[PDB]
Amino acid sequence: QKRKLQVGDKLANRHGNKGVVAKILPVEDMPHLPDGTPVDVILNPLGV
Amino acid sequence: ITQVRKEKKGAGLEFATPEEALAAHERGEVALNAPIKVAGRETSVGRLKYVFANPDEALLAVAHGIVDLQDVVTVRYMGKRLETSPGRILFARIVAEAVEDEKVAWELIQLDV
């Protein structure tokens, strides 16, 4: 099976910040740069 | 939204009339939320410049960008002339509408913190 990222899948970086995907947004809903580039992942600053 | 902004551009500076303080703010001498004294009372430009008749007017000014939620202004609410920020007034409306009782919600919150 070819598994795509879905809600409930666990993501983590190398610094111990881990979490499950709780929401998958369409591209037009994501925060974007003034040049129009949307971000890919939104992390809560309260985890730092 | 409930914390109020504090400025230091013209803090501690004294004027003689409320119009003089507003004129200094136009030239950039004093900031909007800088603590100042008009005659003998500690106030700020925002409290004098922006006197809103109701929370709706204060939040309409926020929607139009005249003031931020954290700027201290004058708002007439509950029949009282409050020297508060629109965000603190906005928090009061959140409680008032959630409990569907404006007078009880007023007694439930601490507005000035």
Binding site: - | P18, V51, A53, L60, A61
Partner: protein, 226 residues
């Protein structure tokens, strides 16, 4: 595969509040429609407001009048609550004269009637006069949109006239909500509820119709390239 046209349901009580629901909508179109309408509703609906006040024997806004409980600021605050509707489309600016003697509780109805000028809230309280107090006012009402602070327009008809913040917008508050809804096997659909508060000069339905028409007119501007 295109979605069926949504149903526009209205829940309007009185002349100052109304709820409007549009469903079902494609994913993200509740936000796509709600935000532009809210920005137009709060800044573009034509309305009237008090932009200048003249009171006899008053020099500055931060003073008081001997013979009335309310100081100048409180009356100015009460005047910003005044809702007036012009009955003549060509009419642009009127002045309302108020001459009351104490002991009286001055209301909005005490203003002198002007042709093609209607006071929507004649029960609005203006000032409370004690015996011996004379109150003379000449308030200037303009036509405009949105919110204009007194300093950013500075309109004075005569000397000693006090500019007042102009609440031109008849809409008092806009709150729109987007909820997840479904139609059969489709689950990412949007349900948009628009709640509009108005001062009563226009209906919340009329405010929505004007806001939609304004957005429609701006969409026609993307024509005739260069």
């Amino acid at each position: 595969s295109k979605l069926k046209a949504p149903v526009f349901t209205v829940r309007t009580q009185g002349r100052e509040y109304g709820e409007f629901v549009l469903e079902p909508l494609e994913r993200g179109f509740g936000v796509t429609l709600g935000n532009p309408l809210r920005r137009i509703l709060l800044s573009s609906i034509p309305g009237t407001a008090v932009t200048s006040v003249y009171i006899e024997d008053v020099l500055h806004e931060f003073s008081t009048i001997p013979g009335v409980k309310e100081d100048v600021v409180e009356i100015i605050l009460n005047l910003k609550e005044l809702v007036v509707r012009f009955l003549n489309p060509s009419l642009q600016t009127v002045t309302l004269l108020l001459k009351a003697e104490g002991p009286k509780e001055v209301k909005a109805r005490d203003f002198l009637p002007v042709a093609d000028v209607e006071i929507m809230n004649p029960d609005l309280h203006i000032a409370t006069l004690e015996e011996g107090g004379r109150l003379n006012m000449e308030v200037r009402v303009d036509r405009g949109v949105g919110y204009v602070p007194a300093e950013k327009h500075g309109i004075k008809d005569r000397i000693n006239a006090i500019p007042v913040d102009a609440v031109f917008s008849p809409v008092r508050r806009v709150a729109f909500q987007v909820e997840d809804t479904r139609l059969g096997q489709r689950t990412d659909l949007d349900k948009l509820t628009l709640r509009i508060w108005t001062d009563g000069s226009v209906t919340p339905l009329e405010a929505l119709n004007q806001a939609v028409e304004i957005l429609r007119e701006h969409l026609t501007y993307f024509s005739n390239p260069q």
